[PDB]
């Protein structure tokens, strides 16, 4: 599924991401935009044999098990296939675990480069939330 911007903002709000660990909702919307262009089927291979899955491009080295990544730690306790669903619940629950690490949302490289420090509140303006 390809989400609309405000469609995604609403879904993320309902799952508890606004002001999670001090990050306002627009951070998460911006991250999803630059990681996947709001496409839940997005995948990218990494050079270490792991793969990034879904709308928030969560990797199979640390976070989910895809069966083909040797030594996956599977810290989110989920198959990576669950991160490709139209329903973003599994991706959001895992994202909260990721964002609880020391470096917070810096774990998302596209957020760090294209979202961090900007007026991310723009990403939810005009949405009914
Ligand atoms: C939260 C999450 O999974 N974010 C992804 C990053 O982990 C990806 O970065 C790549 O991560 C793999 C596995 O740890 C590293 O081997 C690799 O060096 C790293 N690549 C970069 C450029 O840092 C990122 C890839 O675009 O996708 C999400 O941000």
Short mmCIF file of C-alpha atoms and ligand atoms in Angstrom, two decimals:
data_model
loop_
_atom_site.label_atom_id
_atom_site.label_comp_id
_atom_site.label_asym_id
_atom_site.label_seq_id
_atom_site.Cartn_x
_atom_site.Cartn_y
_atom_site.Cartn_z
CA UNK A 1 0.00 0.00 0.00
CA UNK A 2 1.09 3.57 -0.73
CA UNK A 3 -0.21 5.84 2.02
CA UNK A 4 -1.20 9.45 1.66
CA UNK A 5 0.59 11.88 3.94
CA UNK A 6 -2.37 12.70 6.17
CA UNK A 7 -3.67 9.12 5.97
CA UNK A 8 -0.39 7.95 7.42
CA UNK A 9 -0.27 10.75 10.00
CA UNK A 10 -3.69 9.70 11.32
CA UNK A 11 -2.73 6.03 11.47
CA UNK A 12 0.47 6.83 13.34
CA UNK A 13 -1.34 9.14 15.76
CA UNK A 14 -3.78 6.35 16.65
CA UNK A 15 -0.83 4.06 17.45
CA UNK A 16 0.78 6.42 19.94
CA UNK A 17 3.66 8.03 18.07
CA UNK A 18 2.96 11.69 18.75
CA UNK A 19 5.58 12.91 21.23
CA UNK A 20 7.02 9.42 21.72
CA UNK A 21 10.40 9.89 23.46
CA UNK A 22 10.11 13.60 22.69
CA UNK A 23 9.59 13.24 18.95
CA UNK A 24 6.54 15.04 17.56
CA UNK A 25 4.37 13.20 15.04
CA UNK A 26 5.78 15.03 11.99
CA UNK A 27 9.17 13.40 12.57
CA UNK A 28 7.70 9.95 11.94
CA UNK A 29 5.79 11.07 8.83
CA UNK A 30 8.92 12.71 7.40
CA UNK A 31 10.97 9.60 8.17
CA UNK A 32 8.50 7.38 6.33
CA UNK A 33 8.47 9.73 3.34
CA UNK A 34 12.25 9.73 2.82
CA UNK A 35 12.72 6.07 3.77
CA UNK A 36 10.02 4.57 1.53
CA UNK A 37 7.89 7.28 -0.14
CA UNK A 38 5.07 5.95 2.05
CA UNK A 39 5.17 2.51 0.36
CA UNK A 40 4.66 -0.46 2.67
CA UNK A 41 6.23 -2.80 0.06
CA UNK A 42 9.57 -0.96 -0.07
CA UNK A 43 12.66 -3.11 0.38
CA UNK A 44 16.38 -2.40 0.01
CA UNK A 45 19.32 -4.73 0.35
CA UNK A 46 22.29 -3.75 2.54
CA UNK A 47 25.83 -4.80 1.66
CA UNK A 48 26.08 -6.89 4.84
CA UNK A 49 23.39 -9.37 3.74
CA UNK A 50 20.57 -7.77 5.67
CA UNK A 51 17.51 -6.11 4.13
CA UNK A 52 15.47 -3.05 5.10
CA UNK A 53 11.73 -3.68 5.06
CA UNK A 54 8.57 -1.65 4.77
CA UNK A 55 7.43 1.90 5.28
CA UNK A 56 10.09 2.61 7.91
CA UNK A 57 12.84 0.47 6.33
CA UNK A 58 13.53 -1.66 9.38
CA UNK A 59 16.50 -3.94 9.03
CA UNK A 60 16.88 -7.68 9.43
CA UNK A 61 20.29 -7.58 11.16
CA UNK A 62 18.92 -6.26 14.44
CA UNK A 63 15.14 -5.98 14.34
CA UNK A 64 13.24 -8.67 12.38
CA UNK A 65 13.94 -12.15 11.07
CA UNK A 66 13.55 -12.82 7.35
CA UNK A 67 15.10 -16.29 7.37
CA UNK A 68 17.91 -15.37 5.02
CA UNK A 69 19.97 -13.07 7.26
CA UNK A 70 22.57 -15.04 9.23
CA UNK A 71 22.60 -14.06 12.90
CA UNK A 72 19.54 -11.81 12.91
CA UNK A 73 18.95 -10.64 16.48
CA UNK A 74 15.19 -10.21 15.87
CA UNK A 75 14.84 -7.68 18.68
CA UNK A 76 11.28 -6.83 17.62
CA UNK A 77 10.25 -10.50 17.75
CA UNK A 78 8.58 -10.43 14.36
CA UNK A 79 9.05 -11.91 10.90
CA UNK A 80 10.15 -9.21 8.50
CA UNK A 81 7.20 -10.08 6.26
CA UNK A 82 4.91 -8.51 8.88
CA UNK A 83 6.54 -5.17 8.08
CA UNK A 84 5.28 -5.30 4.49
CA UNK A 85 1.56 -5.34 5.41
CA UNK A 86 -0.89 -2.55 4.63
CA UNK A 87 -1.50 -2.44 8.39
CA UNK A 88 1.36 -0.47 9.96
CA UNK A 89 0.87 -1.77 13.53
CA UNK A 90 3.85 -4.11 13.50
CA UNK A 91 6.13 -1.50 11.93
CA UNK A 92 5.13 1.12 14.53
CA UNK A 93 5.51 -1.20 17.51
CA UNK A 94 9.00 -2.11 16.29
CA UNK A 95 9.86 1.52 15.55
CA UNK A 96 9.16 2.39 19.19
CA UNK A 97 11.74 -0.19 20.29
CA UNK A 98 14.29 1.18 17.81
CA UNK A 99 13.71 4.78 18.91
CA UNK A 100 14.31 3.72 22.52
CA UNK A 101 17.99 3.13 21.77
CA UNK A 102 20.60 5.70 22.75
CA UNK A 103 20.58 7.52 19.42
CA UNK A 104 16.78 7.73 19.07
CA UNK A 105 15.51 8.53 15.58
CA UNK A 106 19.09 8.83 14.28
CA UNK A 107 18.73 5.10 13.59
CA UNK A 108 16.84 6.17 10.45
CA UNK A 109 19.49 7.51 8.14
CA UNK A 110 17.00 9.24 5.81
CA UNK A 111 15.41 11.03 8.80
CA UNK A 112 18.84 12.19 9.96
CA UNK A 113 19.75 13.58 6.56
CA UNK A 114 16.43 15.02 5.28
CA UNK A 115 14.18 15.64 8.34
CA UNK A 116 16.20 16.28 11.50
CA UNK A 117 16.38 19.92 12.55
CA UNK A 118 13.81 21.18 10.04
CA UNK A 119 10.27 22.30 10.84
CA UNK A 120 8.86 18.79 10.78
CA UNK A 121 5.51 20.10 12.02
CA UNK A 122 4.90 20.88 8.33
CA UNK A 123 4.41 17.16 7.65
CA UNK A 124 1.11 17.10 9.57
CA UNK A 125 -0.24 20.54 8.73
CA UNK A 126 -3.55 20.42 6.86
CA UNK A 127 -4.34 16.96 8.28
CA UNK A 128 -7.39 16.29 10.38
CA UNK A 129 -6.02 14.49 13.43
C1 LIG B 1 15.86 1.48 11.87
C2 LIG B 1 16.43 0.85 10.61
O1 LIG B 1 16.50 -0.32 10.39
N1 LIG B 1 16.90 1.86 9.72
C3 LIG B 1 17.58 1.51 8.49
C4 LIG B 1 19.10 1.59 8.67
O2 LIG B 1 19.50 0.53 9.54
C5 LIG B 1 19.76 1.37 7.31
O3 LIG B 1 21.18 1.52 7.45
C6 LIG B 1 22.03 0.41 7.15
O4 LIG B 1 21.89 -0.51 8.26
C7 LIG B 1 22.60 -1.76 8.02
C8 LIG B 1 22.26 -2.73 9.14
O5 LIG B 1 22.64 -2.23 10.42
C9 LIG B 1 24.09 -1.40 8.00
O6 LIG B 1 24.85 -2.57 7.68
C10 LIG B 1 24.41 -0.30 6.99
O7 LIG B 1 25.76 0.13 7.17
C11 LIG B 1 23.47 0.90 7.10
N2 LIG B 1 23.65 1.76 5.95
C12 LIG B 1 23.88 3.16 6.19
C13 LIG B 1 23.94 3.98 4.91
O8 LIG B 1 24.01 3.57 7.30
C14 LIG B 1 19.24 2.35 6.28
C15 LIG B 1 19.82 2.06 4.90
O9 LIG B 1 19.39 3.06 3.98
O10 LIG B 1 17.81 2.18 6.18
C16 LIG B 1 17.11 2.50 7.42
O11 LIG B 1 17.47 3.82 7.79
#
